[PDB]
């Protein structure tokens, strides 16, 4: 998905004619008559026996495959491939109960009061992803980082005067 | 993930002495008098005012920061940095359905499953909605057999994967 | 398509947050709020105002674009991109009339007689692509190369004893 | 295209002295006693037995050749190489149709067209089948205006490009 | 910039996992490791995850069988990079007169005025016991620069000076 | 030492004009550059010289980007030679080892690797040690075999201090990097 | 391995086209060229296509305005790389006795037996007028090797030999 | 000279075992490698030495891959230092120029660039010339301005021989690479 490449050799042991794919190729049978060994430098890839992403599909993580049997393959007939994009951003979500612990949406909040009629924030638990509390609204002031765990109060993180008033999501 | 990188410059506009970090640095005061511009070429980084990750912290994601006001810093002192890891392995989950459009019993995990008859007692998987991640179905257990690839979305019948059969007995999460 | 990359900056003059795409990205608005300048190192790219390849689409060859107006853009709203694969292999086709000049399909021929009941080859003209005549059948013996022109007889290329008896297509 | 490369080795199995070509070499006898294996990392190459591209010729496309019998050579003498250029710019063409599913007058070029009213006298393009290449439609002439991207296939109505309007008056071929 | 790469089959084959830094776990990526290529740096490599179990250390080089690093099996789970450098290991001796006579003053730390720290006008000879040092003609690290990347220097010209006028010096780190 | 590092000289300010790249040491590039008003240092630390064959005023340039020569405390724009500074990463690395615990008994001091305690000294076991510079590797068996323990710049009153569950140590090496 | 890169706007902006070799045309890719970065090699750059019109030659360096290479306008259409190297430019003088006395014999070509070509047992001094040469103790380019990468050598030890036994020599090319 | 080139030494045959990379000149890697049984040469030509500080038997290794040391005519497997051979690309490059056509009249010979024919000689025009080594650039105007003509290793009986439509030539440079 970023820094990924895959190379198909017509012969075992990374010999013969060779076809290199960075992104997806619907059909490369015009370049290779067979494929008996594959190097995948980056990323994970799905390779299909036949073109336009049809046929038996095998999955190849990065690694070095000198015989098709090494990628569970059946014969030596492949014709198309596609890079799989592992979901970079995932379960970005968070809950805030502010004062104390509890009962006192998933996208950034510039204004504690505007986006949510909550005075301040004094408790909160993470579900997935990493979040960043900002002291003043608009994401200004001191920054504090929260992994995907659960925090009991402004002391479960570092902010003596819990003056949190904004929150952004990490994305990678 | 790994493979990140970040370069700190002495002067504004990516000029002066330059220190390149590719992992975490408990001290770069023996290299850089000050910091006045940053280039993040990969990853997300946590930069610190003082060595050993003390002082004020600023979170920098990829990009080109020609002034320290551009990462909202209070001055040009920095002495340590750490790479925020974004939770990947340990982020995805799945729900598999016994009877077509999500009828029958609804089973769910975020682990894997080498034998669904052993793990879940089902023989065939007729449907499923993947909450998060990308997954692989294999016709037979122990992960051998025909493979079908599933991304984050829903599957009313076994149509979207590449078959007209329900036949599967193992699946696995992709982490790289 | 091979050795291509594109970088979106949220600020003019290649400043600010930056998102890098190798292959296609259906949606990157979670990474960039705006886009005011683009570097495309390799290949040509289509960028769409909105995600999943919808909206106004602009085309960017490799080059360096410091304001959106420089890629004919309208505002600073882009959300998805796709690399365009310029057809590598094209009008691979050829005609053979053998003896003399004339009246005496587009894929390789191991056997002059088997694939076509033609004795030998003594004339031929190219339409598109590069072809390679082989002396003996099965692509053996002397090799001769033909660009996409038109040849009058075995002397329009180099093969005194015109013993051509096979033909392969170039692919790049 | 350009960006190719090819490496010649003295011994079999990619061993011995190594000469790397990235463009055409009229002589490499002052470098390599012999040639017994080749690695083509990019491009398609024409290798020659004698310097100044004389002698027997063998055509090598990307790949790993550990013996000279593997490129069907007669022995290990080589002294020159030249990079077969595969005809790109000058390979594609288009046919544009005045009336829906290819009714009306049928017009065709392989050049470009900055103003189709000027070039062809049509006001709107309702259909077209692209024989070869990838092309760009712009709503207005001189290539400004809305852009739609077309690959090699057919278009019954103006549906496959991104509009419900026929409005166009310029188009261009992509060469890179 | 170090790199280490784990292979699940002998002779650099199978699935491959790459580290640029420490890694507390690879069990999710590789099930066995039977060979390694270390392209930068030297690594502590551990049997289980979280840097535990038995530890083998690996410098640059290509290891095609786990025995070739003395491992007892193909089980490995974490690795962190031996980065130890301790740039804190430089010492220099400076003398008032030449050929290492006069008041002699040893320092492991930089010096912005030797007139201030040491009450000396010139330096006429010098021993570098450890490290690499720049000599400045003026205090506050300005003026003519001289690089002392050797052992001993008996008169100023040895470091390529035509005057004993040197007033500050500092160490190069890497 | 060695490994990668690179240096670029521009005729004009802000990284403009004819450019010259030093990969290793070059004693005269006067034939490529008429002067030098800006430098880029990607790798390593360089000494640059006003005149060829490593003479004249020298300035030292670490990694960094120097848009005009006053940024390298330069005096003019005449430069002619470039040397890369090797900054040895393998120098003083001493280690003390004792036959008794808590630093008692016989004590040897050394700076070089040792295939065998019993061969070069007359200790079977090793019960305490001091690391004076560098970082070392202890082995269970002679000739750098057996279990490995990684020892850095600290002190060790008993074996368990370096992780070992016994005093059995019979070889050691220093690290080089 | 040379590279040159054409930009259609001043200051390295706009569409960009890259050459590794000669190129008879860029009109299909760029309409103007207003600045160039030459990262390897030196280039003849031509006004029109097919290496015609006026010619400007460009070595490594970053040219942000076409005037900075002395061009009269932003029109350029082809370029080929000045590769001229003429490795044919090496000459060596060898002498029978030392300090450049004895029979003296000049050659621009290699020599597999100096006993055969020249009727001499040893070489006792030598002048390298141009190029770089290896000296072999035995004929047919075997035996102890000595590298002559300087100007003059008055006795064998100068090239680091402890005997005048040298019997063949050849030039290094690049 | 300078520019990129690299050299790799392996402890064991066929590119196995501990590895050491020389980027520039290294005088003692005995502390990294115990011996050397295979070498990879990516860039340039190297002189390798049996013993440290550039002494012992030396062998010369061009680009290539040498799986055992007999492939570099080696005698044993002791190596200790490495020097990269600089093979000057800018040496003898002579040029003769005449005031008359077909080599008549005054004739100057030179090897260095020349901002002005009228300043350093008393020719206004240039009608013939010989290039004895290298390749040169003729300019219309003094100080390397005006129209450029590219001259290689040949001879030129009249101006049109180098492409020019007139004898107007008033400066010239040699190429360096």
Cβ of B17 within 8 Å of Cβ of F64? The answer is yes
Separation CA G159–CA G148 (nearest Å): 6
* Same domain, residue pair F1 and F73: yes
Are β-strands F64-66 and B15-21 bridged in parallel, bridged antiparallel, or unpaired?
A: antiparallel
Q: Which positions 109-168 of G are in contact with D (Cβ < 8 Å)?
A: none
B40, B62, B66: residue with CB nearest C15: B66
* Same domain, residue pair G74 and G95: no
Separation CA C138–CA H34 (nearest Å): 52
- CA F32 from chain centre, in angstroms, equals 32
Separation CA A68–CA A77 (nearest Å): 9
DSSP A23-40: S-BS--TTT-S---EEEE
* Same domain, residue pair H135 and H158: yes
User: B–F: how many Cβ contacts below 8 A?
Assistant: 21
Please state, as a whole number, how many other Cβ atoms lie within 10 Å of the Cβ of residue B129: 17
Whether B47 contacts B58, CB under 8 Å: yes
Domain that holds residue G19: 1-85
C63, C66, C70: residue with CB nearest G16: C63
Return phi, psi of residue G69, to 5°. Answer: -110, 10
* Same domain, residue pair E99 and E172: yes
Separation CA F114–CA F120 (nearest Å): 8
Separation CA D114–CA H42 (nearest Å): 50
- CA F41 from chain centre, in angstroms, equals 19
Give the resolution to one decimal, in Å.
Answer: 2.9
E173 touches chain F (CB under 8 A): yes
Which domain-ending residue is among F27, F56, F88?
A: F88
Separation CA C101–CA C113 (nearest Å): 18
* Same domain, residue pair C60 and C107: no
SS3 B6: strand
Number of domains in chain D: 2
Chains A and B are touching, with contact defined as 3 or more CB–CB pairs separated by less than 8 Å: yes
Distance between E19 CA and the closest CA of chain B, angstroms: 7
Cβ of D17 within 8 Å of Cβ of H62? The answer is yes
DSSP H148-167: EEEE-SSEESSGGGGT-SSS
Whether F163 contacts E53, CB under 8 Å: no
- Collect all residues of chain E within an 8 Å Cβ-Cβ radius of residue A69: none
Return phi, psi of residue A113, to 5°. Answer: -80, -40
Q: Tokens 């990019």 correspond to what residue?
A: D42
Separation CA B27–CA B50 (nearest Å): 8
**Whats the size of chain A, residue-wise?**
172
A61, A62, A64: residue with CB nearest E13: A64
Whether G137 contacts G144, CB under 8 Å: yes
How would you classify residue C119: left for phi > 0, otherwise alpha for psi between -120 and 50, otherwise beta? Answer: alpha
Contacting subunits of A (3+ beta carbon pairs below 8 A): B, C, D, E
Q: What is the gyration radius of the CA atoms in chain B, in angstroms?
A: 24
F63 touches chain B (CB under 8 A): yes
**Closest chain E residue by Cα to residue H13:** E62
Are β-strands G78-82 and G55-58 bridged in parallel, bridged antiparallel, or unpaired?
A: unpaired
Which residues are registered as beta bridge partners of H112?
A: none
**Closest chain E residue by Cα to residue F153:** E86
Contacts of F70 (CB under 8 A, 6+ apart): none
* Same domain, residue pair C77 and C101: no
- Collect all residues of chain A within an 8 Å Cβ-Cβ radius of residue B175: 86
Tokens of D15: 């061993």
User: Residue A19's closest CA among D41, D86, D83?
Assistant: D41
Chains F and D are touching, with contact defined as 3 or more CB–CB pairs separated by less than 8 Å: no
**Angle at alpha carbon of residue F153, lines to F148 and F158, rounded to 5°:** 60
Cβ of B62 within 8 Å of Cβ of C19? The answer is yes
Q: Give the burial string for F125-141 (b: 16+ CB within 10 Å, else e).
A: ebbbbbbebbbbbbbbe
SS3 H102: helix
A17 touches chain C (CB under 8 A): no
**Closest chain C residue by Cα to residue B13:** C15
Interface-testing mutation among G3, G8, G13, with chain C (most C C-beta atoms within 10 A): G13
Cβ of H18 within 8 Å of Cβ of E64? The answer is no
Kindly list the distances between the CA atom of residue H131 and the CA atoms of A171, D41, G91, G130, H134, in Å, as whole numbers in the listed order.
63, 38, 18, 17, 7
SS3 C154: coil
User: Residue B9's closest CA among F67, F65, F7, C11?
Assistant: F65
- CA G105 from chain centre, in angstroms, equals 25
Return the DSSP state at C25: B
In what helix (H) or strand (E) does residue F162 lie, and over which residues does it extend? Answer: none
Kindly list the distances between the CA atom of residue A154 and the CA atoms of A159, A165, E1, H65, in Å, as whole numbers in the listed order.
6, 12, 38, 62
SS3 A103: coil
Kindly list the distances between the CA atom of residue F95 and the CA atoms of C55, E128, F166, in Å, as whole numbers in the listed order.
69, 22, 20
Q: In what order do the strands lie in the sheet with H46-51?
A: G168-171, G133-138, G142-148, H55-61, H46-51, H81-84
Tokens of B170: 């193992």
Return phi, psi of residue G65, to 5°. Answer: -145, 140
Maximum Cα interatomic distance, chain A, rounded to a whole number of Å: 69
Interface-testing mutation among F23, F45, F175, with chain H (most H C-beta atoms within 10 A): F23
- Collect all residues of chain A within an 8 Å Cβ-Cβ radius of residue D64: 9, 14-16, 18
**CATH classification of the domain holding F124:** 2.60.20.10
Tokens of C119: 């004795």
* Same domain, residue pair G95 and G108: yes
* Same domain, residue pair F42 and F111: no
Tokens of E54: 């038995």
Whether C46 contacts C85, CB under 8 Å: no
Please state, as a whole number, how many other Cβ atoms lie within 10 Å of the Cβ of residue A93: 15
**Angle at alpha carbon of residue G132, lines to G130 and G137, rounded to 5°:** 125
- Collect all residues of chain H within an 8 Å Cβ-Cβ radius of residue E59: 18, 32
Return phi, psi of residue C69, to 5°. Answer: -55, -25
Whether H69 contacts H37, CB under 8 Å: yes
**Angle at alpha carbon of residue H124, lines to H121 and H129, rounded to 5°:** 75
**Dihedral sign, Cα of residue E10, residue E12, residue E16, residue E19:** positive
* Same domain, residue pair H75 and H113: no
- Collect all residues of chain G within an 8 Å Cβ-Cβ radius of residue C66: 13
D43, D91, D149: residue with CB nearest C46: D149
DSSP H128-152: EEEE-SS-EEEEEETTTEEEEEEE-
* Same domain, residue pair G77 and G156: no
Whether A39 contacts A64, CB under 8 Å: yes
Tokens of A97: 């109960």
Chains C and D are touching, with contact defined as 3 or more CB–CB pairs separated by less than 8 Å: yes
Q: Give the burial string for G66-100 (b: 16+ CB within 10 Å, else e).
A: bebbbbeebbbbbbbbbebeeeebbbbebbbebeb
H62 touches chain D (CB under 8 A): yes
**Closest chain D residue by Cα to residue C148:** D87
Tokens of D109: 């070029």
Kindly list the distances between the CA atom of residue E100 and the CA atoms of E34, E90, E97, E121, E148, in Å, as whole numbers in the listed order.
57, 19, 7, 16, 16
Q: What is the gyration radius of the CA atoms in chain D, in angstroms?
A: 24
Return phi, psi of residue F118, to 5°. Answer: -65, -30
Separation CA B173–CA G13 (nearest Å): 44
Are β-strands D15-21 and H64-66 bridged in parallel, bridged antiparallel, or unpaired?
A: antiparallel
Which residues are registered as beta bridge partners of H89?
A: none
- Collect all residues of chain E within an 8 Å Cβ-Cβ radius of residue F137: 57
Distance between B150 CA and the closest CA of chain C, angstroms: 17
User: A–B: how many Cβ contacts below 8 A?
Assistant: 86
Separation CA F45–CA F86 (nearest Å): 8
Q: In what order do the strands lie in the sheet with F107-110?
A: F107-110, F95-98, F128-131, F155-156
User: Residue B86's closest CA among B151, B19, B172, B175?
Assistant: B175
* Same domain, residue pair B167 and B104: yes
Whether B69 contacts B58, CB under 8 Å: no
Return phi, psi of residue D16, to 5°. Answer: 105, -155
Which domain-ending residue is among F71, F88, F105?
A: F88
**Whats the size of chain F, residue-wise?**
177
Which domain-ending residue is among A87, A115, A149?
A: A87
Separation CA F25–CA F30 (nearest Å): 14
Tokens of F149: 């323990």
**Closest chain C residue by Cα to residue G10:** C64
A63, A66, A70: residue with CB nearest E16: A63
* Same domain, residue pair F33 and F75: yes
Contacts of D111 (CB under 8 A, 6+ apart): none
Separation CA G102–CA G97 (nearest Å): 5
Separation CA B155–CA H5 (nearest Å): 55
How would you classify residue C96: left for phi > 0, otherwise alpha for psi between -120 and 50, otherwise beta? Answer: beta
């Amino acid at each position: 998905k970023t820094g990924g490449k895959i190379s198909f050799y017509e012969d075992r042991n990374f010999l013969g004619r060779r076809y290199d794919c960075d992104c997806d190729c619907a059909d490369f049978r015009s370049y290779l008559s067979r494929c008996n060994s594959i190097r995948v430098e980056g990323g994970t890839w799905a390779v299909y026996e036949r073109p336009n992403f049809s046929g038996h599909m095998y999955i190849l993580p990065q690694g070095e495959y000198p015989e098709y049997q090494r990628w569970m393959g059946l014969n030596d007939r492949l014709g198309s491939c596609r890079a799989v994009h592992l979901s970079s951003g995932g379960q970005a979500k968070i809950q805030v109960f502010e004062k104390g612990d509890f009962n006192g949406t998933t996208e950034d909040c510039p204004s504690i009061m505007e986006q949510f009629h909550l005075r301040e924030i004094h408790s909160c638990k993470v579900v997935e992803g990493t979040w960043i509390f900002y002291e003043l609204p608009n994401y200004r002031g001191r920054q504090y980082l929260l992994d995907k765990k659960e925090y009991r109060k402004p002391v479960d993180w570092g902010a003596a005067s819990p003056a949190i008033q904004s929150f952004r999501r990490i994305v990678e």
